[PDB]
Amino acid sequence: AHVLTKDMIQERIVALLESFDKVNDAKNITATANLTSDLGLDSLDVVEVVMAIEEEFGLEIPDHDADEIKTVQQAIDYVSAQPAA
Amino acid sequence: PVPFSAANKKLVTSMYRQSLKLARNWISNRQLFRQKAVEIRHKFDQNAQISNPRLLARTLDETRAHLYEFRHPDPIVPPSFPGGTKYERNVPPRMEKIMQHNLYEP
Amino acid sequence: HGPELTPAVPFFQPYVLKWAGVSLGLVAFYQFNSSYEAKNGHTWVETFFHPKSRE
Amino acid sequence: LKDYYYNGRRILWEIKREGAEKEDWVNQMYFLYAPSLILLLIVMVYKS
Amino acid sequence: KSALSAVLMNRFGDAFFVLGLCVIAYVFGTLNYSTIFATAYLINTDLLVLIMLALFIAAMAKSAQFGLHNWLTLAMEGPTPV
Amino acid sequence: ELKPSSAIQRGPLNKGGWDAPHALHNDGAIDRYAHWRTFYQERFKYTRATGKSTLIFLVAFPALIGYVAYQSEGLFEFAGKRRGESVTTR
Amino acid sequence: IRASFDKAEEPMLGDYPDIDPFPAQLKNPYKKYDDQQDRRNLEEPLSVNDDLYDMWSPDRFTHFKNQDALKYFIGF
Ligand SMILES: CCCCCCCCCCC(CCCCCCCCCC)(CO[C@H]1O[C@@H](CO)[C@H](O[C@@H]2O[C@@H](CO)[C@H](O)[C@@H](O)[C@@H]2O)[C@@H](O)[C@@H]1O)CO[C@H]1O[C@@H](CO)[C@H](O[C@@H]2O[C@@H](CO)[C@H](O)[C@@H](O)[C@@H]2O)[C@@H](O)[C@H]1O
């Protein structure tokens, strides 16, 4: 079959963020990064990247768990919490 | 009904979630969809600088109605999730030893 | 390789023996009465049928 | 004695596990009820 | 719930086939195809309209016409080769 | 001065046997709902919806299929019939 | 409360909490319940005529009003 690991979620979410353009720049990226402040997002293109990350992993997010993945690391372990890939 | 806040942010972040997801299943094409997505992105960016509560609430409730009318019969769901087709196919049984009810017979 | 195994089970379970034995005995007994009817003109079980005459 | 047998069988000869066993009803349901019922079948079939 | 809806639609049609089967065994006195088709051209036409309408509601329920189509589409919850 | 006898030796009642451990967690809401439905008749009262249901199912529907059953007793024979032949009698 | 038959059984209940009937399907799926399948918390009060608002009840469509849909169907 096809397994994911956490290396993969890492290099997919960062891949997703380097092709997004309204980020500040492509190398202040790491797992620790606030999307609010570090990458210079407004309150609604954090929502455009939540939509992009949920179509990216093929999964769907309710509104009360989309709001709280504000860091990249919370997003990575939240996407790793689900069995679907 | 409220200016710049955490709760008004909560409300229209979820409304932008909803209209993006709702526009997702109308449009078959990719670039027609993303032309349309940048178009309503523009629609959200022409607003969000209103300081009134009167017409902030009036625009808020009618874009809620405008969101209500363009609703879709089938949402696109991934199948292993509660709208989908792979949902609860082989639920693994929980590990339970046998409780017994009779002194003489199993 | 292939599928994972589970422990070995004997084929002739007690229910296989019981149900097969009873139904094969009934079919054998039916064929025995159809054997006996051609030789003697009557069933082997109607030997044991002794009701009173109607009058 | 029956009490000491069955409560030990429930909590735990006691300390073994196999399947050869006859409960109290199987003597006269397999050897009296079941052949009488098969007899009833045969009498109905040849009485027809 | 999908298997429940499919079998209850089919059971609707089965009730109408039991009705038509009762009229078959009444009018012709038999269920055999040979006797029924040997004597079919003689029987009254209102009788045959009653019989064939009941048997058609049966056939219409199982072969999924417009009054009763809801269970085919609701039978995709069973797997692909089913 | 009227006390039952000194020679009684009365003692407590037991049902006897084995206390089976609890295989089922009770639900207070389901138990209250089901106890409410089982004994529904002692809190039943006559209303307009009740009267509608009572007249429709106890008098109206019996009178209707009674009219149908008495009008149609010796009407139909379908036993052996042909084209151009009556299947009713009256 | 909301339905007409739920209103009809109002005077028969006594010592019974008189819940607002809400369909168990139109609840959120992503709120974690004790049973995810029936979408119900463990001691939650059951309505009268609860088997009309259970998960095992009819499907209860969301997109059209029922009088609208009868007009559209008899229309076609
Ligand atoms: C716990 C239940 C107990 C068991 C229930 C079964 C009890 C039997 C009840 C049914 C009952 C109606 C009762 C009405 C009140 C219902 C009260 C309900 C319970 C209240 C607590 C049906 O009787 C009538 O039903 C009418 C309804 O349609 C019909 O009227 C119309 O005409 C039709 C022309 O064809 C139309 O077709 C139809 O369309 C019409 O409408 C008639 O068919 C019929 O007259 C009772 O009547 C019975 O009475 C006896 C007379 O003793 C009759 O036999 C008689 O015997 C001699 C005696 O004197 C007579 O000398 C003799 O001449 C006669 O033969 C019976 O034969 C029977 O008739």
Ligand SMILES: CCCCCCCCCCCCCCCCCC(=O)OC[C@H](COP(=O)(O)OCCN)OC(=O)CCCCCCCCCCCCCCCCC
């Ligand atoms: C004249 C002939 C030509 C006619 C052509 C037009 C026909 C139109 C009428 C068709 C009637 C079809 C038969 C009706 C019974 C069908 C029952 C059924 O399908 O149950 C389905 C229901 C589940 O359905 P649902 O939940 O929506 O789908 C699940 C899939 N996700 O299952 C459940 O919810 C279980 C609980 C409800 C079960 C049904 C209970 C009410 C049934 C009432 C039927 C009454 C019929 C008799 C009426 C006369 C009585 C005197």
